[PDB]
Amino acid sequence: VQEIDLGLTCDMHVHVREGAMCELVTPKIRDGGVSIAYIMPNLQPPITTLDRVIEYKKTLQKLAPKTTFLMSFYLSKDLTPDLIHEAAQQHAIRGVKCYPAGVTTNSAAGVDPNDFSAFYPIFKAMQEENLVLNLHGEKPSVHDGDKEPIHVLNAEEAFLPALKKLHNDFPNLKIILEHCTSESAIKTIEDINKNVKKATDVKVAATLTAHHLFLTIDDWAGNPVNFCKPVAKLPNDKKALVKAAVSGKPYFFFGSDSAPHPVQNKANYEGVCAGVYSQSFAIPYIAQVFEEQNALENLKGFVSDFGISFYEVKDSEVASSDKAILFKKEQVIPQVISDGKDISIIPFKAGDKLSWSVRWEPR
């Protein structure tokens, strides 16, 4: 009977794919309790053109008229400063997402994070247009050479100097280290923000997923359903992520990285697709964590206030003014989420009970 008014919830890291998969998952954004979604661009082929980002958003708006969609480009050599200015002036994108080549789904067309200088004309134009630079901050793996080996466990830590250099060279660019998974990165974000007093001072933030608040290496060792990028790491990393999430600091906010794959793309003996599907119960998953940490009073900031502030979402842009209301009615996560045709997805924590449910209230 207990209720929590979360206002206009934000999930600032969403994958919704194309085709029938997109038709299945895009309505689940609302169902999971999320009013505003930042849409990632790693389609096959990636979103690097204006007409395609415009059509994609309209496709999503058609599937979910009440959901507010913030769009992005895929960082590529095909981008030009002129296209960035055009797209921004037309309100076609709110940011550009960087995938290092080879580290995750549809990242083959991505960048080498040692030569970020080649994209400085893009970053310079983004800075002028007040667009957000989103980073999948992992260095590609390297096991030889003069230098310390890079592997799936330290690839995020190895990326942190690139983050600092970018922030140094573009001090007015808004940058997000997406889905932080390590204690090292959490401290780097806090240290970057030492001189910050009010939320609007934040230039560099980090998003935290639902699943990295629960998972450890043991949970995906032998369970491809829990396998994602960046990989879930050690218990002390999980502890640092949970403390960051409930900290009340304005530079940590929710981005699910809900990444749907059909079940047959997870049940492979080689080349398992990375990604965990959390859209259907996004806010209830987070509520579980905030309850367990006795920190429900900080929930609204993490899943609403801080993301709205960082992305500067105006009320004149929101597709619906309905507020997400959390109510303490227990539910069971289904075993599968299916369109009743050719697509079955295994949802995060399939079979488990959640203490909270979410509904929508006008006004």
**Smallest distance, a second copy to C-beta of residue 336, A:** 11
C-alpha neighbours within 13 Å on the C-beta side of residue 282:
35
Q: Is 138 in the site for Zn ion (CB under 5 A)?
A: no
Q: Which does 268 bind (CB under 5 to 8 A by kind): Zn ion, a second copy, none?
A: a second copy
Q: Is 268 in the site for a second copy (CB under 8 A)?
A: yes
Q: Is 292 in the site for a second copy (CB under 8 A)?
A: no
Among 183, 237, 257, 305, binds Zn ion (CB under 5 A): 257
257 annotated ligand-binding residue: yes
Among 43, 63, 272, 296, binds a second copy (CB under 8 A): 272
Q: Which does 153 bind (CB under 5 to 8 A by kind): Zn ion, a second copy, none?
A: a second copy
Q: Is 243 in the site for a second copy (CB under 8 A)?
A: no
Return the sign of the alpha-carbon dihedral for residues 81, 87, 91, 96: negative
Among 49, 141, 298, 355, binds a second copy (CB under 8 A): 141
The 3-state secondary structure of the chain, one letter per residue = CCEEECCCCEEEEECCCCHHHHHHHHHHHHHCCCCEEEECCCCCCCCCCHHHHHHHHHHHHHHCCCCEEECEEECCCCCCHHHHHHHHHCCCCCEEEECECCCCCCCCCCECCCCHHHHHHHHHHHHHHCCEEEECCCCCCECCCCCCCECCCCHHHHHHHHHHHHHHHCCCCEEEECCCCCHHHHHHHHHHCCCCCCHHHCCEEEEECCHHHCCCHHHHCCCHHHCCCCCCCCHHHHHHHHHHHCCCCCCEEECCCECCCCHHHCCCCCCCCCCEECHHHHHHHHHHHHHHCCCHHHHHHHHHHHHHHHHCCCHHHCCCCCEEEEECCCEECCCCEECCCCCEECECCCCCEECCEEEEECC
The residue among 22 and 326 lying less far from Zn ion, judged by its C-beta, is 22
Pairing of strands 337-338, 344-345: antiparallel
91 annotated ligand-binding residue: no
Q: Is 147 in the site for a second copy (CB under 8 A)?
A: no
**Smallest distance, Zn ion to C-beta of residue 292, A:** 25
Q: Which does 5 bind (CB under 5 to 8 A by kind): a second copy, Zn ion, none?
A: none
Q: Which does 266 bind (CB under 5 to 8 A by kind): Zn ion, a second copy, none?
A: a second copy
CA dist., res. 201 & res. 262, Å (int): 41
Q: Which does 234 bind (CB under 5 to 8 A by kind): Zn ion, a second copy, none?
A: a second copy
Binding map of a second copy across residues 323-342, x = CB under 8 A, - = no contact: --------------------
CA dist., res. 74 & res. 255, Å (int): 17
The residue among 4 and 282 lying less far from Zn ion, judged by its C-beta, is 282
Q: Is 156 in the site for Zn ion (CB under 5 A)?
A: no
Q: Is 349 in the site for Zn ion (CB under 5 A)?
A: no
Q: Is 83 in the site for a second copy (CB under 8 A)?
A: no
Label residue 236 exposed, middle or buried (CB < 10 Å: 0-12, 13-18, 19+). exposed
The site that binds a second copy (CB under 8 A) totals a number of residues, namely 31
Q: Is 169 in the site for a second copy (CB under 8 A)?
A: no
| Touching a second copy, residues 192-221 (CB under 8 A) | 216-218, 221
Q: Which stretch binds a second copy (CB under 8 A): 50-58, 162-170, 252-260, 264-272?
A: 264-272
Torsion region of 192: left, alpha or beta (phi above 0 gives left; psi -120 to 50 gives alpha): alpha
Q: Which does 257 bind (CB under 5 to 8 A by kind): a second copy, Zn ion, none?
A: Zn ion
15 annotated ligand-binding residue: yes
Residues at the binding site are: 13, 15, 97, 136, 179, 257
Residues at the binding site for Zn(2+) are: 13, 15, 97, 136, 179, 257
Residues that bind Zn ion (CB under 5 A): 136, 257
Residues that bind a second copy (CB under 8 A): 141, 143, 149, 151-153, 216-218, 221-227, 231, 234-236, 263, 266-274, 346
